[PDB]
Design a protein around this ligand. Structure first.
Ligand SMILES: NS(=O)(=O)c1c(F)c(F)c(S(=O)(=O)CCO)c(N[C@H]2CCCc3ccccc32)c1F
Ligand SMILES: NS(=O)(=O)c1c(F)c(F)c(S(=O)(=O)CCO)c(N[C@H]2CCCc3ccccc32)c1F
Ligand SMILES: [Zn+2]
Ligand SMILES: [Zn+2]
Lengths: 260, 261
């Protein structure tokens, strides 16, 4: 049903998914006037991120992004509850306007953005069940800019040709997912928000790292051009591009920062 | 009953107004990747903008906005038909966040925005009719930044405290509307877009001037605290603040500029 363009684009999500028109919607612009240092924001610890290279993890194209399934022994420690990983995926723009992060910083997009989705496994049995519940989800967001080639992101990007079309899947050998995180992960923005796709439930604790990672121009172009939303046999293919939500209003609220 | 905040705010407009989820939506972020210089975009001429000071024009709060009615003898020359003025209005933020323009430039909001709405009077007998026809409307947008006191904007703002509530009306003596436009009107952005409120019709030819005008902090504060969306007797009053739509996706679309650099 829902898409990022045309008649079924983000202004019409709230028909079928009423939370998309409710409170606490993400993503948002991160800008200095709404930032406030909170010394309670200590470093997260990423446990079980070094995935067994003797295990394979499913990469899918689901017609909205590309997702990598992650094992529930992978978790974040440092939040009030343990949050266990469920999947990671990316958002991007298109080669004519290669500025497709979801969050913006001082009004500026980054080229792309990686999200590592986790759910409160102390309170809930699985990610779906947690996804509409209080304290349900925690997402780590990495902002991505063009720069150097990044061998670690290429661990995912080398498999994109096998998940070109909707419904397709590939197996990815385990690698250390912490290699996808930026420098100085102690430095981050934190706020309470929502899923950025339907059903837009306002159940996400967001952690957006302050520092971006770099990928090369070729890796960015590959991510922007490799994938389609549509099934292989669809006579009207659509490229998977511009798969980010516009920023939401965020008034009389703060975004907490772990850095001054 | 649509609003800019809460359950009836902008992500819900398309439930009742389908064009709000349609094509060609405004406003947009004006940034380099989507600009293209077009030498055919020659200067507009503003005719009959100098409204007589002995005449008076109706200022009205309709609950979603405050508009000044303008006479159909006021025209823009330069488009592919004559477009005659119908009304102007503003968009703004709030006292704790004076960043309420609709268009943004390279990701930055301006303090407020003035829209002067025109309709194709060669083709249509009124703006209402024009409003659902392709390029039936042409809106001029002036980006407003916090700066010096502006006596020309004050000719409007000094009356707003007199139209505080929905349905209220006041008369504003004529003045030269061109005093609301910025320097170097020849430099503008041009694109096909939409109304930025419901019903979000995709029928507007937008001209956004490159250069902002300034109004003062005190003018912004008065603008941001003077008006209500509700009637004088409403037991649930709602301040008219933050009355701007977020910028829209704009892909496949280009914005044409009359300036190259
Ligand atoms: N930006 S975001 O908000 O992090 C974000 C996405 F962008 C996004 F596309 C998805 S997806 O399934 O629809 C495609 C895989 O990526 C998700 N998963 C959510 C929504 C569906 C229900 C559910 C159930 C359990 C865990 C997560 C989710 C998502 F969380
Ligand atoms: N930002 S914008 O897109 O320029 C813009 C507004 F912001 C704005 F609030 C209004 S409104 O106050 O009339 C309430 C809107 O339903 C308008 N007027 C349009 C829309 C309704 C039909 C009509 C008929 C004659 C003249 C103008 C208009 C508007 F054009
Ligand atoms: Zn995401
Ligand atoms: Zn307007």
């Amino acid at each position: 049903k829902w898409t990022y363009f045309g008649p079924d684009g983000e202004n019409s999500w709230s028909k079928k998914y009423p939370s998309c028109g409710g409170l606490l919607q993400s993503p948002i612009d991160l800008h200095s006037d709404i930032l406030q240092y909170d010394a309670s924001l200590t470093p997260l610890e990423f446990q079980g991120y070094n995935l067994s290279a003797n295990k394979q993890f499913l990469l899918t194209n689901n017609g909205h992004s590309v997702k990598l399934n992650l094992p529930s022994d992978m978790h974040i420690q440092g939040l009030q509850s343990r949050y266990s990983a469920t999947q990671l995926h990316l958002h991007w723009g298109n080669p004519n306007d290669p500025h497709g992060s979801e969050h913006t910083v001082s009004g500026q997009h980054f080229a792309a953005e990686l999200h590592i989705v986790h759910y409160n496994s102390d309170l809930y049995p699985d990610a779906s069940t947690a996804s509409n519940k209080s304290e349900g989800l925690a997402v780590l967001a990495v902002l991505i800019e063009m720069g150097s080639f990044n061998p670690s992101y290429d661990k995912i990007f080398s498999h994109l040709q096998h998940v070109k079309y909707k419904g397709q899947e590939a197996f990815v050998p385990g690698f250390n997912i912490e290699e996808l995180l930026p420098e100085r992960t102690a430095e981050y923005y934190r706020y309470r928000g929502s899923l950025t796709t339907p059903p837009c439930n306002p159940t996400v604790l967001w952690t957006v790292f302050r520092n971006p990672v770099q990928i090369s121009q070729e890796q960015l172009l590959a991510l922007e051009t490799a994938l389609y939303c549509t099934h292989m046999d669809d006579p009207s293919p659509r490229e998977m591009i511009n798969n980010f939500r516009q920023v939401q209003k965020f008034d009389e609220r703060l975004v907490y920062t772990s850095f001054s």
